[PDB]
Amino acid sequence: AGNATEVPANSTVLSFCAFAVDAAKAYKDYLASGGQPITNCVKMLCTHTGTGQAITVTPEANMDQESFGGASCCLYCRCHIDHPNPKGFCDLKGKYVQIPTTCANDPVGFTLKNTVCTVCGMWKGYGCSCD
Amino acid sequence: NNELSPVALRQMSCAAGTTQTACTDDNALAYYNTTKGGRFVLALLSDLQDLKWARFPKSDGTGTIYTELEPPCRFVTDTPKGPKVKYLYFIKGLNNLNRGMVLGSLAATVRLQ
Amino acid sequence: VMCGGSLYVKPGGTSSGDATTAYANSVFNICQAVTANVNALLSTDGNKIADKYVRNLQHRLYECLYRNRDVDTDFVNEFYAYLRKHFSMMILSDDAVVCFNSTYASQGLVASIKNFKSVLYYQNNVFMSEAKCWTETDLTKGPHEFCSQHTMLVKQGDDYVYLPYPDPSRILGAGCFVDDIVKTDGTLMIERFVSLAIDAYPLTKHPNQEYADVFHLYLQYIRKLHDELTGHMLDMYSVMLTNDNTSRYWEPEFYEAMYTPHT
Amino acid sequence: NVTGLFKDCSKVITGLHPTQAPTHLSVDTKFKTEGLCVDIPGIPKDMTYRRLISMMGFKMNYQVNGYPNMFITREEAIRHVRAWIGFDVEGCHATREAVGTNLPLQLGFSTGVNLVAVPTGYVDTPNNTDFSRVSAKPPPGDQFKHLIPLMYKGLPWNVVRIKIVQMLSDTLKNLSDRVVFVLWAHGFELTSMKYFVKIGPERTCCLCDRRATCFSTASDTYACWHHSIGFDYVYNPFMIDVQQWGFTGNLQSNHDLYCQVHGNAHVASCDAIMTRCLAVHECFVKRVDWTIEYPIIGDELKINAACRKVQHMVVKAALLADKFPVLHDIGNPKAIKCVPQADVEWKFYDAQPCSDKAYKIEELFYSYATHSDKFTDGVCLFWNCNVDRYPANSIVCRFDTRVLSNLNLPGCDGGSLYVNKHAFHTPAFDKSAFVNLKQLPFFYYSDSPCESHGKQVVSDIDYVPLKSATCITRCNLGGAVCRHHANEYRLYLDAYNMMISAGFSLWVYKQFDTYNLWNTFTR
Amino acid sequence: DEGNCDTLKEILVTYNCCDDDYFNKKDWYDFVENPDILRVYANLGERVRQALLKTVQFCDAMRNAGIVGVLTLDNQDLNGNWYDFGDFIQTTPGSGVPVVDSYYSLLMPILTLTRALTAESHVDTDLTKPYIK
Ligand SMILES: [Mg+2]
Ligand SMILES: [Mg+2]
Ligand SMILES: [Zn+2]
Ligand SMILES: [Zn+2]
Ligand SMILES: [Zn+2]
């Protein structure tokens, strides 16, 4: 019964990251040694008009960024492991995320590395009003 | 209260095919009530698409039975190799009781999705 | 009773130190067993009884219990024989084992555990919890425990005999904890290790694996003790013993002799 | 295609709101417009749903530079015996709020330990995932009925993983510095090892120096085997797949071929023991290799020196006692004389003749069935060879397989697998073999001068007061010392005791007697 | 048998010995455990005593009126009042023998289990008055 969920092109990555002790560094070492990034993420459809703020309640892209199903970007939420947020749940479960179309091939890697500036609400570098 | 089928239906592999001669060789899975008057078979289980005839020698092995078959039953049992489609073949003209008995034995014996 | 340093008054019950404890306990045990059988047979419906002879037994039992007034030797005789055929007992002091018909018991013609519970309740003023009353169906492996020994069915020589084997934690505890500081130093006392090994022997036939290792550990200990003893003796004074005949203590036929019926 | 990995098992039929659906295949289809997703504000996100997530089919065969392999080859496993531990698990199916997955229930290892754990699984919530307790039931198989009572005797998992770390730690602290699990139905065991395993780059212990094999989640620190109390994760196990090695049916029928010892009491540890027994057979019951080495753990070199001394002495004594014409050596692959000078004719036999010295080392596989009536001249010498009943003339030295020590490890089938340097496998021990011989009684033969000062004979050689009746070393009469002989006797007695406590047993032809050594002594 | 001791529970709660919520105090029936069960049982002594007194009165009247018949337990309500003369017979008055063997013989253990005669120790068998000196 049930419903299948992952395509065979993700088995090694998901296993090796669900057994590791530091999921983040594990995934970074995986990529950094010739790995194929994760890839059945849910992809949205919208207007590419609105705030550049990736974290949002409703797909709000610009002509450059690209809306994604948030929950399917938190690696922690993807491998079914616990989150390092001291308390106590992932935030990207419920929202949408918008990633620069350039780097928006690997969503999980970006979500791991970059962060939104608290002021401009946008990615530090893509872009930020601060300084 | 009332129990339905204190059941002794073991399993055999035998012959079956699309026509009386298309009954080739060892590819059928028969459930058999080995009654008083010989081994009486009830249902046939295979992965082959559809087969109109099974071919099993008599209780004395003289003639090979020419038994036309039900339209196969569709269901997806599972094994370590994931899903596995199988087809259940009833001998056409079977009362509800033997249907129920065969279904009980099979479903309690083999896992489905 | 002179407990502490003052005299009290013992209300009742035995004082388990007099001249005849084990035997009086055996008598009391048989009494309770017979009482339970009687209650079982009398508290069952008559019409449900199939056999005519058994309705005759129950009927005349009610007779000889309440209607009659003095003894009737033949009834006692045939009832005692009935019990000896469908209840067979083995009694050491307050410690019993019963080999009984099973279908009779199911029908209610002899006593099962529930009857013992009821009898103890109204005639002993205690509640026998059912977590302490074992039960066995297959007669190969024997009684589940008797006199704090377990039974195992082992093929010895050319036939299949029963053997008793203790509880391993008990033997190890006995090995580690003593009650005098000269019972420590194994050098002086190897004899008690011999006795302990004699008690531990039948473990060797156990299908498990730590269990046999208990016995083999004891043997190797004895060897170690003898070696260090000769060493010490040669050390303090220079003599070496002339003859020992102790080598038969660390070799496993001296022990298995004890469970071979020919003495 | 798809896999069974992370296959959902919830009974509800509706897909998930894309913003809380882990993948593009586990979304619902109203949002599925041409493989893409469109948010339909007519429906909101659920705020209560609990979907169990099956955890089977893990498939781990990666290549990262900082991380060590988890499945090792056959040679890397042969090298690291001492560290093998069987493993088997029993299962249970999920019932009401989900169906289609198994949960670990009873665990069993090569040691006779059996742990039971309450059924727990990985559940989701609108905010996160969750490790919680779920309801289950045993398999409908009849032979699995001995599992019905176990479903109410479980333990919370943390207790179980702590107990596991502790059991391993005090089984292996004195042998290896790792652990390799031998297993059969590889998949489900790998599934179960999600509960208490954690992998990652190689690390060294804290407050000790050996490689670290434990993890603590609370304090976040590692440990070796010795200093691991309160830690609850194995940090880098290794594995092995016995059935991968080209085997056919269930391991029951396969094991049943050779070992008639390990029966099947219906648990899991039984399967573990059978698996390890089989793995030992497949790699060790052959002929012994001489290229494989092992570290010493420990004290072993004393046992070796003792074996040297005792061999030299016993053979010299037997020769000088009976003066055999020919010495039929047996089982010696290197034609090296034990006693260095001996006028007796000295053969060499073996079932493995080397290249050189093959002209010396005649090929010979002994068996009393046949060669019983062949070497009826002189005497044989079965040093550590393993045959059936020995001929009535011989000087056998055979390792008893019943002793306990950390050197010999259980093998098949009842015979154990000694490990000193190169692992020797010896068959089971029995008495029928020695039906022609008798235990060598202890003694000590010397033949040399004495103390000195005197350097002559009666009576100017230094005497101290040793009174023992078995040091057959004239000069000796009760004062029997000549210092030299005395402390030599002490040394050799110590060595003999150590050797024979290590496990080895001695035997001699029935004709032996000590007196004729005295008769030799009279000069 | 603690698996189905329901009728007993009903008697105890009916005659105000203890009250229902007690029976969830697990191990209520045990003797070594929870010794208050002795008091709870003892609360039936007075009623058991009244039963015996009334049995004596009936035996008196039955001998006086010249009647013969076996007395049994299951013909007496828990107030002592008898009934059910099924197979009594007739004789000259003042010459009727009531049979009381099975009755007393079966009743016996309950007398000490429920501490029946504890009324006898009072100043005049009257539970309110002090103890005899
Ligand atoms: Mg089993
Ligand atoms: Mg199993
Ligand atoms: Zn998350
Ligand atoms: Zn900003
Ligand atoms: Zn450490």
- Tell me, yes or no, if D4 comes closer than 8 A to chain B by beta carbon: yes
Which 3-state string (H, E, C) describes chain B?
Answer: CCCCCCCCCCEEEEEEECCCCCCCCEEEEEEEEEECCEEEEEEEEECCCCCCEEEEECCCCCCEEEEEECCCEEEEEEECCEEEEEEEEEECCCCHHHHHHHHHHHHHHCCEC
Which 3-state string (H, E, C) describes D90-139?
Answer: ECCEECCCECCCECCCEEEECCCCEEECCCEEEEECCCCEEEEECCEECC
What residue in C sits closest to D402 (Cα-Cα)? C216
Contact B113 D100 (CB under 8 A): yes
Structure tokens at A113: 């590395």
Q: For residue C168, which residues of chain D lie inside 8 Å, CB to CB? A: none
In contact, C128 and C122? CB cutoff 8 Å: no
Ligand 3 centroid distance, CA of D168 (Å): 35
Q: Bridge-partner residues for B14, per DSSP? A: B28
Burial of C56 from C-beta contacts in 10 A (0-12 / 13-18 / 19+): exposed
For residue D475, say if its preceding peptide bond is cis, omega within 30 degrees of 0.
Answer: yes
- Tell me, yes or no, if D3 comes closer than 8 A to chain A by beta carbon: yes
> Of the candidates D255, D282, D101, D250, which has an alpha carbon nearest to the alpha carbon of residue D185?
D250
Contact E31 C126 (CB under 8 A): yes
CA distances in angstroms from D104 to A26, D91, D93, D108, D190, listed in the order given: 27, 5, 9, 11, 11
Q: Which residue has the tokens 């010495």?
A: D327
Burial of C171 from C-beta contacts in 10 A (0-12 / 13-18 / 19+): buried
> Ramachandran region of residue C133, left (φ > 0), alpha (ψ -120 to 50) or beta?
beta
How far, in Å, CA of E64 to CA of E93, rounded?
6
- Tell me, yes or no, if E29 comes closer than 8 A to chain C by beta carbon: yes
> Of the candidates C30, C180, C32, which has an alpha carbon nearest to the alpha carbon of residue C120?
C32
Burial of A5 from C-beta contacts in 10 A (0-12 / 13-18 / 19+): buried
CA distances in angstroms from D365 to D350, D353, D376, D399, listed in the order given: 6, 11, 17, 20
Resolution (A): 3.3
In contact, D348 and D334? CB cutoff 8 Å: no
Contact D140 B80 (CB under 8 A): no
DSSP, collapsed to helix, strand or coil, labels residue D500 as: helix
CB pairs under 8 A between C and D: 31
Q: How many CB atoms lie within 10 A of CB A32?
A: 12
In contact, B31 and B20? CB cutoff 8 Å: no
- Residue C12: alpha-carbon gap to chain centroid: 27
For residue D367, say if its preceding peptide bond is cis, omega within 30 degrees of 0.
Answer: no
In contact, D375 and D389? CB cutoff 8 Å: no
For residue A127, say if its preceding peptide bond is cis, omega within 30 degrees of 0.
Answer: yes
- What residue ranges do the domains of chain A occupy? 1-131
Q: Which residue has the tokens 């196990």?
A: D237
CB within 8 Å of C6: residues ≥ 6 apart: none
Contact A70 D19 (CB under 8 A): yes
Structure tokens at E62: 């039955």
Structure tokens at E34: 């929870």
Q: How was this structure determined?
A: cryo-EM
CB within 8 Å of D271: residues ≥ 6 apart: D86, D88, D108, D184, D251
Active site residues of C: 93-95
Structure tokens at D483: 């210092």
Phi, psi of D185 (to 5 degrees): -70, 60
In contact, B46 and B57? CB cutoff 8 Å: no
How far, in Å, CA of A109 to CA of A73, rounded?
9
Mutant choice from C221, C224, C240 vs D, greatest count of D C-beta within 10 A:
C240
Helices (H) and strands (E) counted in chain E, each on its own, are 4, 3
- Strands B73-79, B82-90: pairing is antiparallel
Q: Is E84 marked as binding a ligand? A: yes
DSSP, collapsed to helix, strand or coil, labels residue E98 as: strand
Q: How many residues does the structure list for chain A?
A: 131
Mutant choice from D274, D400, D467 vs C, greatest count of C C-beta within 10 A:
D467
Neighbours of A (≥3 Cβ pairs closer than 8 A)? Answer: D
> Of the candidates A4, A62, A66, A91, which has an alpha carbon nearest to the alpha carbon of residue D37?
A66
Tell me the nearest-neighbour CA distance from B36 into chain D, angstroms.
27
Q: How many residues does the structure list for chain C?
A: 263
Nearest to D112 among C210, C220, C242 (CB): C210
Q: How many residues does the structure list for chain E?
A: 133
- Tell me, yes or no, if E31 comes closer than 8 A to chain C by beta carbon: yes
CA distances in angstroms from D49 to D14, D43, D125, D129, listed in the order given: 11, 16, 6, 11
In contact, B7 and B105? CB cutoff 8 Å: yes
Q: Which residue has the tokens 């009334």?
A: E54
Residues in the 5 Å CB sphere of ion ligand 4? A 117, 119-120, 128-130
Q: How many residues does the structure list for chain B?
A: 113
B–C contact: 3+ Cβ pairs < 8 A: no
- Residue D40: alpha-carbon gap to chain centroid: 63
Structure tokens at D485: 């002989």
In contact, D417 and D423? CB cutoff 8 Å: yes
Q: Bridge-partner residues for D346, per DSSP? A: D327
Q: How many CB atoms lie within 10 A of CB E39?
A: 11
Q: For residue B80, which residues of chain D lie inside 8 Å, CB to CB? A: 187
Contact C210 D497 (CB under 8 A): no
Q: For residue C118, which residues of chain E lie inside 8 Å, CB to CB? A: 1
> Of the candidates C135, C141, C139, which has an alpha carbon nearest to the alpha carbon of residue C205?
C141
Q: For residue A6, which residues of chain D lie inside 8 Å, CB to CB? A: 2-3, 5-6, 23, 25
Question: What DSSP designation does D62 have?
Answer: -
- Strands E98-99, A96-100: pairing is unpaired
Which 3-state string (H, E, C) describes A53-65?
Answer: CCCECCCCCCCCE
Question: What DSSP designation does D74 have?
Answer: S
Burial of B7 from C-beta contacts in 10 A (0-12 / 13-18 / 19+): exposed
Q: Which long-range contacts (CB under 8 A, 24 or more apart) does D141-146 make?
A: D143/D266, D146/D266
Structure tokens at D286: 């052959």
Return the H-helix or E-strand segment holding D253.
helix D251-255
DSSP, collapsed to helix, strand or coil, labels residue C102 as: coil
- What residue ranges do the domains of chain B occupy? 9-113
How far, in Å, CA of C162 to CA of C152, rounded?
6
Structure tokens at D463: 């005497």
